[PDB]
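$ run holo --ligand "fe (ii) ion" --emit tokens
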Amino acid sequence: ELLKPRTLADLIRILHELFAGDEVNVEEVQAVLEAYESNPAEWALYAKFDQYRYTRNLVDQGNGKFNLMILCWGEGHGSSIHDHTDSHCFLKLLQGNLKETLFDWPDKKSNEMIKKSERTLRENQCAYINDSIGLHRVENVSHTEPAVSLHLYSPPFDTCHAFDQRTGHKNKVTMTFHSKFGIRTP
Ligand SMILES: [Fe+2]
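-- output --
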């Protein structure tokens, strides 16, 4: 039974329930993420920005079944073109806007990567990506407003691949956290 999360903590409890089995209902997860209304007071603990690039801040480990984390994007910060290691990935905006660009999996030949589409994700919107759909890049193109987003990955993964736009070549990347449970990482 899907109910509206009243708070971030409530969202987390609902997610534990949803992920209690070994099979995940993606539509239900997206729906509950969208129904959570961003309340900056509830996630301030996790919103730790960096001057130079975006930060990843772990919120919950999902009793093993998922990682839930908050990403903080300064003006002009963006990500690489990346995959998600055969996991489910959900992204919800908690503050500001992000441009999401979708790319096709590259061919064998070196070649400018092909942009499928792009869209602006606005506050409280929740999107879904998985490798079968394609690859993506996420960016805060604003010059005046920092952005904050909530991400959920299941199963959790800490390694993925980044892709070069000019050539399609991929490189392995290990994901790092800037903070976990509100505490900065060494
Ligand atoms: Fe992503």
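-- notes --
The chain has three helices and 13 strands.
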